[PDB]
Write an enzyme that holds these catalytic residues in place. Structure first.
Site, mmCIF file in Angstrom:
data_model
loop_
_atom_site.group_PDB
_atom_site.id
_atom_site.type_symbol
_atom_site.label_atom_id
_atom_site.label_comp_id
_atom_site.label_asym_id
_atom_site.label_seq_id
_atom_site.Cartn_x
_atom_site.Cartn_y
_atom_site.Cartn_z
ATOM 1 N N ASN B 146 0.836 -1.241 0.000
ATOM 2 C CA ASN B 146 0.000 0.000 0.000
ATOM 3 C C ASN B 146 0.820 1.216 0.000
ATOM 4 O OD1 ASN B 146 0.834 0.098 2.660
ATOM 5 N ND2 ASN B 146 -1.084 -0.739 3.426
ATOM 6 N N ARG B 284 2.815 8.381 11.503
ATOM 7 C CA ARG B 284 2.376 8.033 12.810
ATOM 8 C C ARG B 284 1.936 9.299 13.545
ATOM 9 N NH1 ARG B 284 1.536 3.742 10.958
ATOM 10 N NH2 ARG B 284 2.513 1.775 11.541
ATOM 11 N N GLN B 313 -4.975 5.491 18.882
ATOM 12 C CA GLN B 313 -5.933 4.961 17.934
ATOM 13 C C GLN B 313 -6.685 3.796 18.530
ATOM 14 O OE1 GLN B 313 -3.680 6.111 13.858
ATOM 15 N NE2 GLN B 313 -4.443 3.983 13.893
ATOM 16 N N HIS B 332 -7.798 6.058 10.205
ATOM 17 C CA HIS B 332 -6.636 5.380 9.626
ATOM 18 C C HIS B 332 -7.018 4.370 8.595
ATOM 19 C CE1 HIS B 332 -2.725 3.117 10.499
ATOM 20 N NE2 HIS B 332 -2.644 3.810 9.408
#
Lengths: 374, 374
Positions: B146, B284, B313, B332
């Site tokens: 990705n 991040r 998260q 995310h």
């Protein structure tokens, strides 16, 4: 002389006193070599709001210093508007495509001292060129001032539609997380086939910007581009637009609105697109049948639609494109970023100075000049 | 063997029965030559939702037909969780960076049969590498799956922030028009200075995609890129991050989170950025001090902030980044589009087949193998 200038309204909370940045990026020319506007001077700071009634395109001081009159208004619709009222003896008319003062044959007729119709932007569709030709009204525009601004908007919207940005942002803003809800309609743009209807200044800038996304590029136009450009961008030519649609995952419309192109995207041509195709239209609202598009999104034939052009415009508060599924619309603003405004305000001044000092106006800016298309 | 696979929840309206399009574009390799995943077979149709609990990464049939057990859950936090309970005897643990099952020292110590810790995605910072090294646990990821996905998300967010897309879309959605309210914080990206903190697979894919936008490119990293790449993108090298900040209009963070980069963006370093700069961070969340970024946006020093990574998260419902001014946040999701999912579910299968058959896992997928970092 008298300059009649039609501008859009100031922000809701007033004319800005403070801006996000101190300056704007330095650019020398446009792709192809056209140089940026060259006024003798400017009385604004690049980056300020210039297209609203309080910005005045930064023209008052120059105009009033040479004993000219500057009338600025936002009222331009109808016979009883300030514009119509002031048109009779204005020597120069200025408006932007974002809030245009239409120069109908009727108004042109009653416009007795009218010598110059200036578009602060690009796109004189609000002007009746035959009447200006007949009446000897010079029509000029600030060529290329916002072609790049529009191309940026196009690529932004293509990415946002394919990647499902708007819905994902809503989940974040409203307290959600919901990864699966965001991504169940999200794809990557890489290797999709993207086609442009017309490859002019904006269409070419868009193709150039998409190339490194490793998409397969297609186009259709009245005339083919030079072979070396076709080679450099690895373009696939389509002689008809109906032949281009079925093979494209994304189609961007960058063509003018003519009777030939009115409603060119309708229930019937929409049946030629692949299931889940995306359309971006920053050209003219009426290239698309309003309801045909809405139906395609509701049914899933199309997976997204975005643009900043509508019909009618300003759009009615209940215009269905505002809330239809998978839309990425904005109001009509792509070519009126603060950046684009600094160029067309400077271009506007450069042309005025030319016209007033008796110098010739660059050929690139001229549309109708002295009884004819120039 | 027992395979414990932690995935995110299905969509709130259930697992999709239908999708927007029929197929995915065809890609053969990643930039640089690496081939896409080569499992012996796949039991999913590329384009389906595979990363959620009902998707199961398309692994059950393969695993159950070979006598293995597959336990799929989204409950992974804490000691009473289904993950913690099942971990004690699992041979393989699989999780994605978007919903990570943390393999802390204590959990690795309790996982008696643990042999393979697989990241269905990229980035194994949710795994204590020393503990895996010390216990001979193989740690693998689906390298490159990705990187392009993330890079597209970054360019989309840069454009969106600069052109003020989100607030412009809300005016449309809400029934307004308000041209000046939309453009008083809207600029073109063209000719701005754009810098990336690291130039890895993602950073370089971002640079390549921004080049045709005619931005001035800057970068800093642990090591310099080859001069050929520097010359082809017309890159300006900065030896330190602090040297780069002050010349950039836009800064994108594409570097790992280490003790060294933790809170690298804070009240002090933010004083080095030009007024009105933008920051994009898809790396991040903790690279940035949460409240310093909010304060910079609130005080008008920064003109926008966007990304898909947060600390912590999932982000608490009241996390300040959800609502701070000029944010372009998403949950995310950048590397979990339907397209990316198809590549990492295929790579997950590739790796498992290798593992169960005693064949070597591709070198590019290994993180930790045989008591040492690979």
């Amino acid at each position: 002389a008298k300059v009649l200038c039609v501008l859009y309204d100031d922000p809701v909370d007033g004319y800005p006193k403070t801006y996000a940045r101190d300056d704007l990026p330095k650019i020398d020319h446009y792709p192809g070599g056209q140089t940026l506007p060259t006024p003798k001077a400017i009385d604004f700071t690049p980056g300020q709001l210039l297209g609203s009634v309080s910005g005045e395109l930064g023209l008052r001081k120059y105009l009033e210093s040479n004993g000219h009159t500057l009338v600025v208004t936002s009222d331009k619709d109808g016979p009883d508007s300030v514009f119509e009222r002031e048109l009779v003896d204005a020597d120069v008319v200025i408006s932007q495509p974002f809030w245009p003062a239409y120069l109908t044959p009727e108004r042109i007729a009653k416009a007795k001292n009218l010598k110059l119709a200036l578009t602060a932007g690009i796109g004189s569709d609000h002007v009746d060129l035959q009447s200006a030709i007949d009446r000897n009204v010079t029509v000029a525009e600030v060529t290329y001032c916002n072609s790049i601004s529009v191309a940026e908007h196009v690529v932004m919207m293509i990415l946002s539609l394919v990647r499902n940005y708007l819905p994902s942002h809503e989940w974040a803003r409203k307290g959600g997380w919901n990864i699966a809800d965001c991504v169940s309609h999200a794809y990557d743009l890489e290797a999709m086939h993207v086609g442009t209807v017309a490859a002019g200044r904006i269409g070419l800038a868009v193709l150039r910007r998409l190339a490194p996304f490793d998409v397969h590029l297609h186009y259709t136009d009245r005339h083919r581009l030079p072979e070396s450009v076709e080679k450099e961008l690895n373009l696939t030519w389509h002689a008809t637009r109906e032949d281009m649609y079925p093979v494209c995952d994304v189609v961007t419309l960058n063509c003018p609105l003519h009777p030939e192109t009115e409603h060119m995207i309708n229930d019937e041509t929409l049946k030629l697109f692949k299931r889940g195709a995306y359309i971006v239209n920053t050209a003219r609202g009426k290239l698309c049948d309003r309801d045909a598009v809405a139906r395609a999104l509701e049914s899933g034939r199309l997976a997204g639609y975005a643009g900043d052009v509508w019909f009618p415009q300003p759009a009615p508060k209940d215009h269905p494109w505002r809330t239809m599924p998978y839309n990425g619309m904005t109001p009509h603003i792509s070519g009126t970023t603060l950046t684009a405004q600094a160029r067309y305000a400077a271009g506007t001044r450069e042309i005025l100075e030319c016209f007033f000092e008796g110098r010739p106006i660059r050929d690139e800016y001229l549309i109708v000049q002295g009884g004819a298309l120039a």
